[PDB]
């Protein structure tokens, strides 16, 4: 498999969206370029909460989910399983077995303007807590009182809240660019792979060989045996390779 | 429209990846047995606006063999799935003109396919009238590849092509085995063909029922009868059911399968399965053992 | 979309008291940060008080010290400014404005002049003998 | 031999944020259960949090729950604190300390008073400038 | 291939005090796994 996925263009966007409709990118059938550590989507925080991230290279990757959000600085550590909050539970919950790398830039020079930015919209009121990895887009006025919310009035609160940033605001209210590379498995769907090192072939010598999981010892010689294009292995009487 | 015919030497496959030459090999596998009955299902309600009921529901136990003799491309696709409702996902092997989309998706409703009223000879064109579903639920694995049904042209009369196929679900793993061979006016041509695979898929969903898809707007050169059971008819859709049998396969030195015999059809089939040969010399050969099975079982305990 | 309505005012005498109320219809208080700004005739607009999104953390100006109390009620979604010991130079028109986030005093940023998103019409408070 | 130096502190404002870091000059992390202690002036030293030797088991106190968090990185060999929602009476001298083995909430034994073996110099943290 | 017996008993009363008994050192860094019935005593710095 000789294919390369350009990771670098995926992670940065021209304009980041709101909480309501982000973008989810799935990556497969490509060489695992996770040496983009420290200079792209994994960087400064380097908070790979995955269970043994180096041993995840052995558990050969079947899907990669890449995401890029922008969240305020008061709740950077809120992206972890088991934590509560209105901006945590009613926006994005994580399952208890999250395996991946979730890393946050101090985005103060590109997500803040002198006139103020109003392109990031959040919720603080919802009917109930949602299932993890789910999104709601529909904008409806919730019923937060005895009065029926059929009109725009008191006890009927809009759920949309647009955060505001400038370079003059202090740390904690500044926007942070949080990028997620998550490598989990749904029910271990062992479908596609990548890491597969191959030594150079050697002929006419007594060597050990391993071809597609078949191990053995002997001498490999070119010959006039012909295979129809389905068949891969060869075998004879008494069932020896 | 359920006439039965016997299948002569059809349904012999390549069970594995390995190359063999000039050997005689015994395989215990799901095969279609020799001289077994197969079901002909017809399709004649072309002009009527009601549903034809010509695509029944078949209970898909341990693999299905399918065959067709049609010059045109009326046969396009197959539906698999236990319930075919919104509860579970369903598999489609739908074919367009030059590509195949295989989708494992949940579908709430399967009402009816599209049905025309007019004649195919008047309007011999099919332009965007294939709509079966309206809602797609949470689903993955929308695989896209080359067409299964290679449009091999048939001209000059009495040259109609044969499409042989078997579908197999083993441990969440779906295998399509197929080959296209040109034949003559025999419905089941007496002869042998080493019958190749095409594709393998990881699915992970058990399949109980399946169903076939036709361009059911208009159909021609289709005869049928109202009689059911042991009768005869002309349908050009052949369905057989596999069984776990043991076979003796003959591998050619060139590398292909050239003949196969059963080991449970005939007594001399048992002799040539025990002797590992296709030619049996004159004599007496002991093949197996007989014993009388008990008719029923009794239990007797004291007072 | 979202409107802010002010109430109160009248003819107060020096030594008296008055209470302004600012009611938001659409947006939610105790998640928004609201403040009061005033404008005298012949002058330029200057803030009075502010309260942030988190709890009831109050902020105040230099000439506002000790006389003016700010309180927010989340039941009626209305913020209250209580005026005590009004002097003769306090005749102005008062505006309430809301700005999402804990906007007032976030690092190197005070609530100087007006950059708030949501506005109102204003109520005139005059004081004289 | 083993010293536990602290970096951070200074002048902040209420509602702000600040970062604490304790880099162990001697024995590594992920083998010793470390903790943090603070001292209000005129008051006794009381701990705020721990993290265990194994995995990321995390504890807090009642008056600081939810607002403050702890995390560590073994490559830099340090432990990190993120101060969120700073209020008035948190003004304290913060210490970092360690003890071998999982000692914070170990059986019927919580991290009560001062039982750790290593001590640090400490940094000052003040609020409401 | 061990032919012998293992004997163990709880000692919380001569090997533990309130400030912590630190006379028992348990080495956790070594270049390679030990041979059977073998000790290393030498104190040299282990860089990871």
Residue numbers in the entry:
A (entry chain A): 329 to 569
B (entry chain C): 26 to 328
C (entry chain D), D (entry chain E): 1 to 129
E (entry chain B): 425 to 472
Study text:
To understand the structural basis of Nanosota-9’s potency against Omicron, we determined the cryo-EM structures of the BA.5 and JN.1 spike ectodomains complexed with Nanosota-9. The structures revealed that Nanosota-9 binds to both spikes in a similar manner: it engages all three copies of the RBD, with one in a “standing-up” conformation and the other two in a “lying-down” conformation. (B) Cryo-EM structures of JN.1 spike ectodomain complexed with Nanosota-9. While three Nanosota-9 molecules bind to each trimeric spike (which has three RBDs), their distribution is asymmetrical: two of the three Nanosota-9 molecules crosslink two RBDs, connecting one standing-up RBD with one lying-down RBD. The results indicated that Nanosota-9-His exhibits tight binding to all three spike ectodomains, with dissociation constants (Kds) of 0.078 nM, 0.060 nM, and 29.4 nM for the BA.5, XBB.1.5, and JN.1 spikes, respectively. The lack of change in the resonance signal after ACE2 injection from the Nanosota-9-Fc-bound JN.1 spike ectodomain indicated that ACE2 could not displace Nanosota-9-Fc from binding to the JN.1 spike ectodomain. Sequence alignment of the RBDs from BA.5, XBB.1.5, and JN.1 revealed three mutations in residues that interact directly with Nanosota-9: 478, 480, and 486. However, these residues all interact through their main-chain functional groups, so side-chain changes likely have little effect on the binding of Nanosota-9. However, the JN.1 subvariant replicated inefficiently in the mice, reaching a titer of only 103 TCID50 in the lungs on day 2, suggesting that JN.1 differs from BA.5 and XBB.1.5 in their replication efficiency in the current mouse model. Nevertheless, Nanosota-9-Fc significantly reduced the JN.1 titer in the lungs to near the detection limit.
The SARS-CoV-2 spike protein is the top target for antibody therapeutics. It is a homotrimer on the virus surface, consisting of three copies of the receptor-binding S1 subunit and a trimeric membrane-fusion S2 stalk. During viral entry, the receptor-binding domain (RBD) in S1 binds to its host receptor ACE2 on the cell surface, the spike protein is cleaved by host proteases at the S1/S2 boundary, and S2 undergoes a dramatic structural change to fuse the viral and host membranes. In this study, we discovered a novel nanobody, named Nanosota-9, from an alpaca immunized with the Omicron BA.5 spike protein.
